[PDB]
Amino acid sequence: KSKPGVFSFLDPLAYEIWMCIVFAYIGVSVVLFLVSRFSPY
Amino acid sequence: GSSLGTPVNLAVLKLSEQGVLDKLKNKWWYDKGECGAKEKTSALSL
Numbered sequence: 001k002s003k004p005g006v007f008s009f010l011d012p013l014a015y016e017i018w019m020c021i022v023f024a025y026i027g028v029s030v031v032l033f034l035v036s037r038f039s040p041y
Numbered sequence: 042g043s044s045l046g047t048p049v050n051l052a053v054l055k056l057s058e059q060g061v062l063d064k065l066k067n068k069w070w071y072d073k074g075e076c077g078a079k080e081k082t083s084a085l086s087l
Contacts, residue, residue, distance in 0.1 A: 012085065013084060
């Protein structure tokens with residue numbers, strides 16, 4: 001009786017995709033902050 | 042000029058009509074054949 005793993009809900013996407021999702025989240029947030037709070041307008 | 046012409050002609054015709062040759066082909070091509078004629082789904086990759 002295959003006991004489903006906790007964090008089996010992540011199985012549809014590979015570990016690399018989640019990793020790069022986190023990386024892209026950080027990059028997007030930083031670029032947004034930058035391009036919103038740089039110009040002394 | 043061999044006396045074996047008509048008999049072999051009739052033999053192959055009889056075999057074809059009854060179905061021996063097809064069985065032999067199945068035996069030596071499909072049967073006696075390694076691969077005959079579902080995989081779990083994979084997680085998406087980058």
